Every structure is written in C-alpha cells, then in structure tokens.
Amino acid sequence: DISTLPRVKVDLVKPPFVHAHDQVAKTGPRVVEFTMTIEEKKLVIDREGTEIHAMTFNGSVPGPLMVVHENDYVELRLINPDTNTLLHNIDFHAATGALGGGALTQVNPGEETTLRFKATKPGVFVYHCAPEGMVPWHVTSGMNGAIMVLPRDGLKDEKGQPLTYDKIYYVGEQDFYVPKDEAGNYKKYETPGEAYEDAVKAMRTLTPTHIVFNGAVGALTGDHALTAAVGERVLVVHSQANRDTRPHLIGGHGDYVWATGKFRNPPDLDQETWLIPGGTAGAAFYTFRQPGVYAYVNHNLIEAFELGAAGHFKVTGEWNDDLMTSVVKPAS
Amino acid sequence: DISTLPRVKVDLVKPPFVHAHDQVAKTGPRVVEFTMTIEEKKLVIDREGTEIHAMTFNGSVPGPLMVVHENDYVELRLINPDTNTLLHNIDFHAATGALGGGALTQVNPGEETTLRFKATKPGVFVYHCAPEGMVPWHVTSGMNGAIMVLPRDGLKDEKGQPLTYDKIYYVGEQDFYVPKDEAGNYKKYETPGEAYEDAVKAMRTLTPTHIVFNGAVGALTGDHALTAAVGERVLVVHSQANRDTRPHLIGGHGDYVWATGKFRNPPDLDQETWLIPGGTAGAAFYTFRQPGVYAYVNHNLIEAFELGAAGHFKVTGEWNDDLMTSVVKPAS
Amino acid sequence: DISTLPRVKVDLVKPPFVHAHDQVAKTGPRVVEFTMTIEEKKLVIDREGTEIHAMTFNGSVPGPLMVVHENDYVELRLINPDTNTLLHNIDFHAATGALGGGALTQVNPGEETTLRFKATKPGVFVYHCAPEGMVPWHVTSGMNGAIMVLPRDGLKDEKGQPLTYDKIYYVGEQDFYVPKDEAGNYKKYETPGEAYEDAVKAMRTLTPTHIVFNGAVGALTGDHALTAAVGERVLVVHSQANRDTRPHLIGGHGDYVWATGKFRNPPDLDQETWLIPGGTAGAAFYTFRQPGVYAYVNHNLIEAFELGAAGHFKVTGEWNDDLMTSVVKPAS
Ligand SMILES: O=N[O-]
Ligand SMILES: O=N[O-]
Ligand SMILES: O=N[O-]
Ligand SMILES: O=N[O-]
Ligand SMILES: O=N[O-]
Ligand SMILES: O=N[O-]
Ligand SMILES: O=N[O-]
Ligand SMILES: O=N[O-]
Ligand SMILES: O=N[O-]
Ligand SMILES: O=N[O-]
Ligand SMILES: O=N[O-]
Ligand SMILES: O=N[O-]
Ligand SMILES: O=N[O-]
Ligand SMILES: O=N[O-]
Ligand SMILES: O=N[O-]
Ligand SMILES: O=N[O-]
Ligand SMILES: O=N[O-]
Ligand SMILES: O=N[O-]
Ligand SMILES: [Cu+2]
Ligand SMILES: [Cu+2]
Ligand SMILES: [Cu+2]
Ligand SMILES: [Cu+2]
Ligand SMILES: [Cu+2]
Ligand SMILES: [Cu+2]
Numbered sequence: 001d002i003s004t005l006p007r008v009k010v011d012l013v014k015p016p017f018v019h020a021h022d023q024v025a026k027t028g029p030r031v032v033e034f035t036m037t038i039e040e041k042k043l044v045i046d047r048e049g050t051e052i053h054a055m056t057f058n059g060s061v062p063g064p065l066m067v068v069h070e071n072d073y074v075e076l077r078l079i080n081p082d083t084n085t086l087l088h089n090i091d092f093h094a095a096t097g098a099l100g101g102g103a104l105t106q107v108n109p110g111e112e113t114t115l116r117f118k119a120t121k122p123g124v125f126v127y128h129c130a131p132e133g134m135v136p137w138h139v140t141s142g143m144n145g146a147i148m149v150l151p152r153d154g155l156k157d158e159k160g161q162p163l164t165y166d167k168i169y170y171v172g173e174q175d176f177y178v179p180k181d182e183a184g185n186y187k188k189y190e191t192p193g194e195a196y197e198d199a200v201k202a203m204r205t206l207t208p209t210h211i212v213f214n215g216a217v218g219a220l221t222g223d224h225a226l227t228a229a230v231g232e233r234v235l236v237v238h239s240q241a242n243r244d245t246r247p248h249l250i251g252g253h254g255d256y257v258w259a260t261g262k263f264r265n266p267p268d269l270d271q272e273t274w275l276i277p278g279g280t281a282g283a284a285f286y287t288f289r290q291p292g293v294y295a296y297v298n299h300n301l302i303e304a305f306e307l308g309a310a311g312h313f314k315v316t317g318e319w320n321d322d323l324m325t326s327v328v329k330p331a332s
Numbered sequence: 333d334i335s336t337l338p339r340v341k342v343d344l345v346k347p348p349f350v351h352a353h354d355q356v357a358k359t360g361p362r363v364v365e366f367t368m369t370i371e372e373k374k375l376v377i378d379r380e381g382t383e384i385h386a387m388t389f390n391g392s393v394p395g396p397l398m399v400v401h402e403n404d405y406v407e408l409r410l411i412n413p414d415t416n417t418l419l420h421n422i423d424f425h426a427a428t429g430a431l432g433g434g435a436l437t438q439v440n441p442g443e444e445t446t447l448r449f450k451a452t453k454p455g456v457f458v459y460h461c462a463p464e465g466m467v468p469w470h471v472t473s474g475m476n477g478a479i480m481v482l483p484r485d486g487l488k489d490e491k492g493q494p495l496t497y498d499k500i501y502y503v504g505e506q507d508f509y510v511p512k513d514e515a516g517n518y519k520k521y522e523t524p525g526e527a528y529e530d531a532v533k534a535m536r537t538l539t540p541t542h543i544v545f546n547g548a549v550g551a552l553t554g555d556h557a558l559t560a561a562v563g564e565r566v567l568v569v570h571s572q573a574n575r576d577t578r579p580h581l582i583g584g585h586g587d588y589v590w591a592t593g594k595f596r597n598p599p600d601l602d603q604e605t606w607l608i609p610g611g612t613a614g615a616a617f618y619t620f621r622q623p624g625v626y627a628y629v630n631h632n633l634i635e636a637f638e639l640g641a642a643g644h645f646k647v648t649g650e651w652n653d654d655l656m657t658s659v660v661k662p663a664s
Numbered sequence: 665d666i667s668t669l670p671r672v673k674v675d676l677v678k679p680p681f682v683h684a685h686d687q688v689a690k691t692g693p694r695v696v697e698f699t700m701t702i703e704e705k706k707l708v709i710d711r712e713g714t715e716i717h718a719m720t721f722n723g724s725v726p727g728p729l730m731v732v733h734e735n736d737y738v739e740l741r742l743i744n745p746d747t748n749t750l751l752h753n754i755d756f757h758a759a760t761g762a763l764g765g766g767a768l769t770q771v772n773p774g775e776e777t778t779l780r781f782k783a784t785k786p787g788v789f790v791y792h793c794a795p796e797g798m799v800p801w802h803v804t805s806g807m808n809g810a811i812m813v814l815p816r817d818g819l820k821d822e823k824g825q826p827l828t829y830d831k832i833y834y835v836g837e838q839d840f841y842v843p844k845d846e847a848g849n850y851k852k853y854e855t856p857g858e859a860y861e862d863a864v865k866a867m868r869t870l871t872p873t874h875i876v877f878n879g880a881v882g883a884l885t886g887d888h889a890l891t892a893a894v895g896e897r898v899l900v901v902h903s904q905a906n907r908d909t910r911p912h913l914i915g916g917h918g919d920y921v922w923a924t925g926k927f928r929n930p931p932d933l934d935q936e937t938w939l940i941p942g943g944t945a946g947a948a949f950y951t952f953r954q955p956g957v958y959a960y961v962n963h964n965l966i967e968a969f970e971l972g973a974a975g976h977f978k979v980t981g982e983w984n985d986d987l988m989t990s991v992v993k994p995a996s
Contacts, residue, residue: 002654075659091582093604097622097656099583104658114659121585121602130582136633177634203634206539207870242633244576244607244908246941250755250794251763253785259924260591264601269928270785272757273943275908277578279605279631290761299943301800301906302841302867322666324761326768327739327778334986407991423914425936429954429988431915436990446991453917453934462914468965509966535966538871574965576908576939592923596933609910611937611963 002073002116006030012064015145015214016169016226018237021067023154023164031116032068035077038107040084043142045176045210046217046308050186052178053195054215055086055129055143061215062172063127063145065237068119069152075116082110085192086131088138092117093125093279094147102130119149123262124281128241136242137199140177142215144241146170146281151263155235155285157256158266163285165235169226173298173309174215175208175243208243211298212308220311226296228288230317236296239281245309247284248273248299251292254284273299290324291317334405334448338362344396347477347546348501348558350569353399355486355496363448364400367409370439372416375474377508377542378549378640382518384510385527386547387418387461387475393547394504395459395477397569400451401484407448414442417524418463420470424449425457425611426479434462451481455594456613460573468574469531472509474547476573478502478613483595487567487617489588490598495617497567501558505630505641506547507540507575540575543630544640552643558628560620562649568628571613577641579616580605580631583624586616605631622656623649666737666780670694676728679809679878680833680890682901685731687818687828695780696732699741702771704748707806709840709874710881710972714850716842717859718879719750719793719807725879726836727791727809729901732783733816739780746774749856750795752802756781757789757943758811766794783813787926788945792905800906801863804841806879808905810834810945815927819899819949821920822930827949829899833890837962837973838879839872839907872907875962876972884975890960892952894981900960903945909973911948912937912963915956918948937963954988955981 008030013019036058043054043061057063068074074095080088087108091100095117098104105113128144129135155163179187179198186209189195202209213220220226228234238247247254256267259274261281268274276282298309340362345351368390375386375393389395400406406427412420419440423432427449430436437445460476461467487495511519511530518541521527534541545552552558560566570579579586588599591606593613600606608614630641672694677683700722707718707725721727732738738759744752751772755764759781762768769777792808793799819827843851843862850873853859866873877884884890892898902911911918920931923938925945932938940946962973 077660093580095583095656096585097583097652098624099627101656102582103624104656105662107662110664111662112660113662115656116659117656118654120655123602123604125604135637139633200638204638206632206634242631244578244632246908246943248757248943250766251759251761253760260600260603260606262600262602262604268924268926270787270926271924272787272789272926272945273941274924275607275939275941277605277607277631279578279580279633281604292762292767295763299906299941300870300908301803301943302870305799306864306868320761322782323784324759324765324768324779324781327780328741328776330769330771330775330777332774409992425912427915427988428917429915429984430956431959433988434914435956436988437994439994442996443994444992445994447988448991449988450986452987455934455936457936467969471965532970536970538964538966574963576910576964592932592935592938594932594934594936607939609937609939609963611910611912611965613936 002031007033009033012058014060015062015064016171016220018065018168018170019067023150025069025152029071031073031075033075034066037079037081038084038088040086043215045212050178052176055138055141057143057145061142061174062239065170066147069150070119070122072119073116074119075114077112077114078105078107079112080107080109084109088129089131090127091130092127092147094119094149096120122149122151122264124148124237124283126239126241126279126281136203139241140175140203142174145172146237146239148237155263158269163256164233165285166232167228168235170237171213173238173240173245174212176210177202178209208307210308211303213311217308225312225314228313228315230288230291230315233287235283235285237281237283238276240276240278243278245276246273246299247276248297249286250295250297252286252294255287256285258283288315289320291315291319334363339365341365344390346392347394347396348503348552350397350500350502351399355482357401357484361403363405363407365407366398369411369413370416370420372418375547377544382510384508387470387473389475389477393474393506394571397502398479401482402451402454404451405448406451407446409444409446410437410439411444412439412441416441420461421463422459423462424459424479426451426481428452454481454483454596456480456569456615458571458573458611458613468535471573472507472535474506477504478569478571480569487595490601495588496565497617498564499560500567502569503545505570505572505577506544508542509534510541540639542640543635545643549640557644557646560645560647562620562623562647565619567615567617569613569615570608572608572610575610577608578605578631579608580629581618582627582629584618584626587619588617590615620647621652623647623651666695671697673697676722678724679726679728680835680884682729682832682834683731687814689733689816693735695737695739697739698730701743701745702748702752704750707879709876714842716840719802719805721807721809725806725838726903729834730811733814734783734786736783737780738783739778741776741778742769742771743776744771744773748773752793753795754791755794756791756811758783758813760784786813786815786928788812788901788947790903790905790943790945800867803905804839804867806838809836810901810903812901819927822933827920828897829949830896831892832899834901835877837902837904837909838876840874841866842873872971874972875967877975881972889976889978892977892979894952894955894979897951899947899949901945901947902940904940904942907942909940910937910963911940912961913950914959914961916950916958919951920949922947952979953984955979955983
C-alpha cells in the first residue's frame with residue numbers, strides 16, 4: 001500500500017548542479033515528491049544575442065535532474081501557470097505506461113496535475129514535454145531534462161565493485177533550430193502560432209543552428225565552469241532528448257561509461273568518446289589525475305566549437321609529470 | 333553433403349509480420365528455400381500524396397524478414413521479371429563472400445538466379461540490392477530488408493537463460509531522398525535514367541525528405557497498428573540499410589536489446605533508446621506491462637513526427653496503478 | 665625514474681600501413697620516441713580534381729598510426745617547419761592532462777617541441793591538432809591520426825583467450841567541407857586567412873562535401889587496395905576525428921570489434937556494421953574465409969559511394985562453395 005510508504009519532498013536545483021541525495025539508499029522505498037513549474041521565457045542563446053522563446057521545466061534548459069532509487073515512486077506535481085500560452089505535459093522515459101505519463105499530464109495554462117509512477121529500472125533517463133502534434137517543437141525549444149534512478153546499492157563497476165562519486169554534474173545538451181531567411185539571418189516571431197510553420201521548416205532541415213550545454217553558448221565556462229580537484233571522482237550525466245551526441249573530456253577519459261545510461265549493464269571502460277543516442281541520457285565516471293582546464297565537448301568539433309557544444313572544467317591540485325610533461329618547450 | 337540435408341520451402345509474409353518459424357530448432361541443419369520477386373512500382377509515401385518509383389523485394393518496403401537458424405543454408409531464388417526496367421541483385425550481410433552474394437546475383441529484367449549461402453553467424457542482418465555504380469539509389473528506393481539467423485537453441489539473456497518471444501514484428505525504416513526544386517517542391521520523373529542525376533544530387537544532401545516505417549507515413553497506425561497484450565513478450569526487429577536510427581518505445585523500454593543485432597553478444601538491459609547504425613539490423617525484446625497506445629519511434633523526434641518515423645502499438649489488458657497513476661487529474 | 669628506462673626510436677610509415685611492432689610486449693616499459701613533421705600541402709581529393717589545402721602530420725591524411733604498449737611513455741618530437749604558415753599543436757586522446765598535450769605543444773612555423781606522456785589506457789585513440797579558436801578547421805583539413813596502445817599481453821577475446829592478428833591496417837576517414845558558392849561549385853582561396861570564414865560557413869552546414877579513406881576518393885583501390893589471404897587474421901583500425909562512421913566489410917564481418925576502441929572491454933562479436941563515434945578510433949578483427957574483392961565502406965552508402973568513403977580488399981586463396989555458391993547463375 002503506497003500510502004504506508006514514507007514521503008520525502010525534494011527541492012530541485014538548477015543544472016548543472018544536482019539536488020542532494022544518497023547513492024546507497026538509506027531508507028526503504030519511498031514516494032519522492034517533486035514539483036516543477038513550466039516557464040515559457042525569452043532566452044539569449046549565443047554571443048550574438050540571438051533570442052528565442054524557450055519552453056522550460058522550472059525555468060532552465062535543461063530542466064533539473066531528478067534523483068530517486070530503483071523502486072521508489074516518483075510523484076510529480078506539474079504546474080502550468082496562466083502566464084504561459086501553450087499546453088504542455090511530461091513524458092518520463094523512466095516510467096511505464098501512458099506514453100511515459102504524457103497521456104495523463106496535459107495541462108493548459110492555469111492548470112496543474114500530479115502524476116505518480118514506479119521507477120522500476122535503474123539508469124539515467126530523459127524526460128520531456130510531448131504534446132500531441134507538437135512534440136519536436138516543444139522538445140527543441142528546451143523542454144527536456146533527465147531523471148536518475150540509482151540502484152538501491154549504488155553504482156557498480158564491471159566486476160561488481162562499488163563506484164562512488166564525490167561530485168555529480170548534469171549536462172543537458174540542446175539542439176535549437178532557429179528559423180533562417182534565405183540570406184541566413186534568424187527570424188523572430190510575434191506569437192507562437194505565427195512561428196510554428198517556420199519552426200517546422202527549420203526542424204525539417206535536420207541541421208541545428210545551435211547546440212548548447214546548459215542553455216547557451218558558453219554557459220559552462222568562466223565563473224560557471226565545472227570544478228573538481230585532482231583525485232575526485234566525478235559523475236557527469238549527459239542527456240540529449242532529440243539528437244545523437246558524442247561526449248568527450250579533453251585531456252581526460254570516461255573511466256566508466258554507461259553510454260546509453262542503464263546501470264544494470266556493465267560500464268564501458270576507458271572511453272575517449274561515447275555515443276549517447278538522441279532520446280537518451282548517459283553517464284560517465286572519471287577520477288581526475290591532473291589539474292588545469294579541461295574542455296568537455298560534443299566531439300563533432302564543429303558542433304562543439306562553432307555551434308556551442310562545449311564547456312569547461314577547472315581542476316585544482318598537483319601536476320603529475322610522470323603522466324605528462326613538456327620535455328622541450330616550443331622553441332625555434 | 334548439402335544434398336543429404338532436408339529442404340524446407342518458406343512462404344514469406346509482408347512486413348511487419350514474419351513468417352512462421354521455431355525459435356529453438358526442431359530439426360538439424362536444413363536448406364531453407366526462399367523465393368523473392370523484384371517489383372519496381374509506384375508508391376505513395378506520405379499524406380500529401382507524394383509518389384515515388386520504389387524498388388522492392390516482393391512488393392514491399394522493406395522486403396520481407398527471412399528467418400533461419402545458425403548453420404542452416406539459405407537458398408534464394410531471386411526473380412527479376414521482364415516488367416521491370418533495371419538490373420538488380422542481392423547482398424546479404426549474413427553471408428560470407430562475393431560481396432554478400434551481390435557479385436553472383438546480377439539479374440537483368442527477364443532473368444532469375446539462385447544463390448545459396450551458409451548462415452554461419454547468429455543475429456539479425458540487413459540484405460539489400462547493390463548494383464555496381466548504383467548502390468545507394470537502389471537501397472534508398474526501398475530495396476532492402478532483413479534476415480534473422482536464430483541460434484539453434486533460441487535467444488538467451490545476459491545470464492544465459494532463455495528468452496522466448498510470443499510475438500515478433502519487423503520494422504524496416506526507410507530514408508527517402510525525393511528530389512526538390514529550388515522552391516522545395518518534389519520533382520517527378522519520366523524515366524529512371526532521367527531521374528538518376530537528381531536522385532544523386534538529392535542523396536548528396538545527406539538530408540532525407542521522408543523517413544518511414546513499413547514504406548509510408550502512418551503505415552504502422554490505425555487498422556495497421558502493431559498489437560500486443562499485457563504480459564506478452566514481443567521481439568521487434570528493426571533495420572536501417574543506410575542511415576543511423578534510434579528506436580524507442582514511448583511508454584515502454586527495450587528490456588533486452590541487441591542494438592547491433594548479433595545474438596552471440598549479451599543484450600543491453602533496460603534501454604530507453606538504442607542506436608542501430610546504418611547498415612545494421614537490431615532487435616529489442618519487451619514484455620508489455622500496461623495497456624493502451626504506445627508510439628514506437630525513431631527518437632530524433634523531428635524524424636519521427638515530421639518526417640514519418642513513427643508507428644503505434646495497441647495493447648490490450650489491465651491497467652496497473654502501482655506502476656503509474658494520475659494522482660490529481662489536470663485541473664484549474 | 666624515466667631516465668633508467670629503455671628508449672626505442674620508431675620510424676613511422678604511411679597509412680594504411682603500420683610500423684612494425686610486437687603484439688605481446690617483448691620488453692618492459694619503454695620510452696617510445698616518435699618524430700612527426702607537420703606539412704601544409706595541396707591535395708587532390710576526388711576524381712574531378714578538387715584540390716584543397718590540407719594540413720597534415722607527416723605528409724599524409726590521416727597521420728600515421730603510432731603503436732605502443734600500455735604503460736610505455738610516448739615521447740613525440742613535433743616539428744613545424746618554417747615553410748608552413750599556421751600555428752599547430754597536438755592533442756592525444758590517449759594522454760591525460762593539458763588538453764591531451766595541446767596546451768603544451770603549440771608550435772609556430774620554425775618551431776619544434778617534445779611532449780612525453782604515459783600511455784595508461786589500452787586501446788586505439790584519436791590524435792589531432794587543436795589550436796585554440798581554430799580546432800575544427802585544422803581537424804577537418806586532415807590534421808588527425810591515431811595511436812594504438814596495446815595491452816602488454818596483446819589482444820584478447822570475450823573469453824580472455826588471445827587474439828593475434830597477422831596483418832594490421834589503419835583506415836583514417838576524413839570529412840572535408842569544401843566551400844561552395846550558391847551554384848554549388850567549390851571555391852578556392854588565395855590565403856588561409858581569406859579562406860577561414862567560408863571554411864567556417866561550410867563546416868556549419870554540418871554536411872561534408874567529401875568523406876574519404878586515406879585522403880582521397882579511391883585511395884584504397886586499384887594498386888593501393890588492401891590485401892589479405894584466406895585464413896589470415898586482419899585487424900583494421902578505423903578512426904574518425906570529427907564525425908560518426910559505420911564501417912562494414914562487404915562480404916565479411918567484424919568477428920571481434922571494439923567499436924569505441926578500448927581493449928579492456930570485451931569485443932562485440934559477429935558484427936555486420938558498427939558505430940565509431942566522431943572523435944574515436946575503433947578496431948575490428950576478421951579472419952578471411954573467401955577470396956576475391958571486398959569493399960570496406962562507411963555503411964551510409966551515400967557517404968560510401970557518392971562521397972568517397974569506400975576502399976577495397978583483394979583477397980587471394982581458395983573459394984569455399986560450402987559457405988557460398990551460385991546454384992543457378994543468372995539466366996533467362
Ligand atoms: O514491482 N513491480 O514492478
Ligand atoms: O567514498 N567511498 O569510496
Ligand atoms: O524566406 N524568408 O524566410
Ligand atoms: O544525428 N543524430 O541524431
Ligand atoms: O538522424 N539524425 O538525427
Ligand atoms: O545502458 N547501458 O549503458
Ligand atoms: O561450417 N563452417 O563454417
Ligand atoms: O514460452 N516459454 O517461456
Ligand atoms: O532546379 N530545379 O530543380
Ligand atoms: O546519420 N546516420 O547515418
Ligand atoms: O553519417 N550520416 O549518415
Ligand atoms: O550485436 N550485438 O548486439
Ligand atoms: O602509473 N600510474 O598511472
Ligand atoms: O599466431 N598465433 O596464433
Ligand atoms: O556566395 N558565393 O560564395
Ligand atoms: O553525424 N556524426 O557525427
Ligand atoms: O552530430 N553530427 O555529427
Ligand atoms: O571501447 N570498447 O570497445
Ligand atoms: Cu511543452
Ligand atoms: Cu521521448
Ligand atoms: Cu535493385
Ligand atoms: Cu550492405
Ligand atoms: Cu594544425
Ligand atoms: Cu579530440
């Protein structure tokens with residue numbers, strides 16, 4: 001009887017940060033209660049000032065990472081305030097039935113709903129809006145995130161030994177399709193209905209105009225670079241709700257990678273780059289061995305360095321000259 | 333001596349259905365005899381009435397699924413009737429030598445040929461036409477299918493335990509490249525030779541105009557939706573002869589997935605989405621747990637919902653409120 | 665103390681050939697010394713005579729395959745002669761720290777540098793140039809290769825048994841983005857600086873104009889076809905520094921494949937086609953069973969047969985009619 005289970009309310013945080021949780025479950029199964037408020041908002045996505053009408057869960061692109069354990073129940077209160085204009089819903093790839101919840105969560109502006117589902121499979125999973133007839137438009141306007149369902153005994157390596165992370169980050173990668181005129185400049189629009197056919201035309205090109213981490217070019221850089229220390233074990237969850245990506249840590253590796261995100265499978269070891277298919281979340285575990293700046297990229301390097309799919313880690317600590325050294329510095 | 337082996341004649345069926353077979357081999361190795369007749373035909377591929385000149389094995393896009401067991405011999409009689417205009421052949425990715433058979437099976441209109449090969453590797457494999465100098469044109473005109481080579485003791489899970497499906501479906505996904513003029517409308521053509529250079533130009537864009545299951549937008553919907561019941565174990569074989577795809581069952585999972593289709597490998601567990609590379613067939617096994625409508629899609633959602641790569645399952649049975657429920661239905 | 669280790673100087677060879685090495689390490693850890701000289705040069709990449717300004721390591725696209733064992737040190741002397749015009753560097757995906765070495769290896773024309781790093785992870789890995797602000801331009805101008813870090817006890821299969829190759833080839837696959845005018849003809853340019861913005865524009869299309877093996881359409885054909893004999897065990901290392909590929913041996917298989925290239929993982933068995941993500945090297949092992957011509961392709965068949973991503977094997981030996989035969993040759 002679900003009513004006899006503990007309830008715990010989670011307060012979500014903005015990506016790339018992740019709400020506090022325990023890797024190894026410290027309680028039995030629980031109903032884990034989340035609330036998200038949909039926000040349609042203008043977002044500047046590049047250094048040129050290109051502004052789009054984003055559709056968000058909780059104000060961010062991506063939406064926040066939710067974290068539960070296997071066989072917990074996820075109870076989500078989804079709020080669509082009357083300041084929004086569109087119908088929205090939510091589909092969890094972690095859930096079973098009713099189009100992942102989408103069939104049960106259609107909320108007009110001024111409405112809310114509560115969905116409960118049992119998290120029966122461990123892994124990282126995409127969630128996204130998916131209103132009938134409008135699915136890719138909502139998803140490619142930012143309106144996707146991820147949920148991590150941890151095994152109750154935490155992560156394990158390929159031999160069944162524990163893998164415990166010290167830090168976790170969530171990198172949502174977003175493909176945008178900003179409509180272009182025949183000279184190639186972006187268009188804007190006066191209403192969502194007036195934008196819709198050219199959004200469809202732009203999407204049909206299958207060529208994103210921007211591919212960004214955490215909602216904008218450069219979002220994971222400078223003061224907002226990811227951080228770690230030498231010797232820290234870091235889990236990076238990476239999702240892409242619509243298009244393949246190939247993450248790579250420049251100067252590092254994925255020591256243990258679940259490229260398609262499902263923890264019942266043994267991880268792939270020692271990866272340089274891995275393929276996360278569109279519509280999937282993946283997770284990579286790495287122990288830093290060197291300080292300095294790293295770039296975390298989609299290793300289509302055009303996508304990374306021209307379209308925006310690049311962020312930075314700043315890592316503190318001691319340099320290891322055994323691992324790498326300049327024997328002769330550049331010189332004439 | 334192959335002449336001492338039993339022969340069995342298979343009568344093929346139209347996708348997404350699959351000819352009757354046994355999962356666990358009930359006989360020793362056999363020569364399994366198949367016949368396919370090539371048909372060049374007009375096909376309407378979308379709701380707008382866009383009509384192409386399709387090139388088919390057995391009248392369908394995809395061609396039918398052939399099913400044998402490991403170390404059977406596949407004997408195919410391939411017929412190119414004189415009502416066709418082009419040279420065709422067949423290449424089996426399951427076979428070894430002679431470009432998969434393509435070098436031995438070149439048939440002008442009015443010709444036939446018989447090829448035999450030993451199915452030495454278990455898995456699902458693409459087959460496709462591949463005439464020298466014209467390969468992608470034939471393949472992207474529909475002229476591909478798949479063959480399943482079952483292990484003699486049937487499918488097994490990651491622990492070596494049997495996996496037995498109750499139903500099997502074959503979803504062939506087809507990328508079409510319908511030539512467009514500079515305003516973006518499709519062109520038609522008066523002969524294959526007159527179409528060829530613009531087919532090549534259209535293909536060179538690397539941007540399909542349509543991506544469909546079972547030969548047309550909506551083919552696997554309505555009266556032709558896939559069906560199952562709660563508790564049924566379903567195997568979905570999915571092929572793509574030319575371009576990557578990322579299947580996903582909306583509201584479900586791939587409980588056991590051979591993404592690259594080869595049964596000697598342990599399956600990946602609990603997949604949300606999986607990557608089937610172009611030129612591969614994959615297979616996913618799922619036990620339905622909830623009734624209702626599911627969408628089975630390529631989870632590039634633009635490809636699914638704008639270009640055609642979406643079908644439906646209709647599932648009968650009892651709803652499980654433990655797995656999912658609406659706690660509070662959408663309301664003001 | 666690294667100075668107490670043996671040093672061995674390797675003399676590199678042009679792809680697709682690979683410098684001599686031992687699969688099982690015959691010495692303890694060593695410092696393996698390599699030298700590469702950067703060459704900017706004109707290269708004709710297609711049958712039409714399209715000529716680009718290539719950026720190369722050691723005069724070739726791809727750069728040469730380097731081979732070491734796990735826990736060897738790689739010491740590379742990188743020379744940028746004063747006959748070049750651009751700044752270059754090198755990033756090894758095999759290395760840890762300093763952006764794979766790129767932060768330590770920036771060489772103006774007329775400069776050289778020496779980098780040492782410990783090869784701590786076994787596998788095949790990409791290396792590429794990556795000058796800050798110019799990364800995809802250099803990589804997509806050819807300026808990438810691979811390094812193989814063998815386990816000290818050589819390759820092993822999924823059961824831990826040895827896999828020993830008789831021959832090894834390195835296929836580098838290169839995506840080029842040759843700028844096109846509005847009629848679709850290639851442009852040329854008078855200086856690298858004058859080419860840069862249109863190179864960026866061309867790259868931003870995400871649509872390669874050419875995808876080639878060993879630097880040009882047809883490079884691995886005719887007198888330069890790959891060769892083998894029936895019964896030979898062949899390892900094909902395949903890299904793609906920027907874009908996904910899906911190799912396939914037409915008429916054969918990948919008997920053992922490390923699609924993402926890392927030897928600590930068990931190989932995938934019996935592959936028809938496999939996905940090597942952009943920014944990765946993979947490796948496939950096959951034992952030839954039939955003589956004749958094979959095509960080795962990227963199985964996006966448009967990429968293979970229209971854009972250039974196809975080569976040939978010529979295999980000598982005895983035909984096996986048990987594996988494949990023409991029962992009835994094509995006839996009326
Ligand atoms: O707890 N049954 O999924
Ligand atoms: O943090 N425990 O390994
Ligand atoms: O055609 N101008 O969007
Ligand atoms: O091209 N990725 O969906
Ligand atoms: O199939 N491209 O997303
Ligand atoms: O989904 N397993 O990485
Ligand atoms: O039966 N030998 O492949
Ligand atoms: O249908 N036997 O599990
Ligand atoms: O340029 N009209 O196909
Ligand atoms: O983009 N798939 O071949
Ligand atoms: O590489 N795209 O099929
Ligand atoms: O090919 N193994 O999924
Ligand atoms: O030898 N330590 O990587
Ligand atoms: O070449 N030894 O298997
Ligand atoms: O617009 N001509 O490159
Ligand atoms: O489409 N491959 O990066
Ligand atoms: O994501 N295409 O390389
Ligand atoms: O990276 N393992 O193929
Ligand atoms: Cu929405
Ligand atoms: Cu989805
Ligand atoms: Cu044909
Ligand atoms: Cu093929
Ligand atoms: Cu360079
Ligand atoms: Cu790189």
